[PDB]
Amino acid sequence: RTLMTFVSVTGNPTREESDTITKLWQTSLWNNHIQAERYMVDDNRAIFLFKDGTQAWDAKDFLIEQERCKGVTIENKEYPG
Incomplete structure (x- = not known):
């Protein structure tokens, strides 16, 4: 039931910055009942990596509205922020 997605950060952040930023979004999602594993690549x-893939697009809708979110990729389709 899991679905892999890509989440990018705008500008030219350091790995530690993006780590803190994306973890912020991951936590927000987690506290809204959308659980995902997160890996810097x-x-x-x-x-x-969403435990429940049916939540991926709803998560994307939130992510792309966040400051510093360059965009989200789901199933080869990109959603710019």
Whole structure:
């Protein structure tokens, strides 16, 4: 039931910055009952692995409205922030 997605950060953050920023979004989602595992794969990009893939797009809708969110990728479709 899990769905892998990509979540990118704008500008040119350091890995530690993006880590703190994306974890912020991950926590917000977690506290709204959308649980995901998070993995940095670039200095400005993370994998959000949603335990319940049916929540991926609702999560995306929130993510792309956040300051510093470059965009979200789901199933080869990109959603710019």
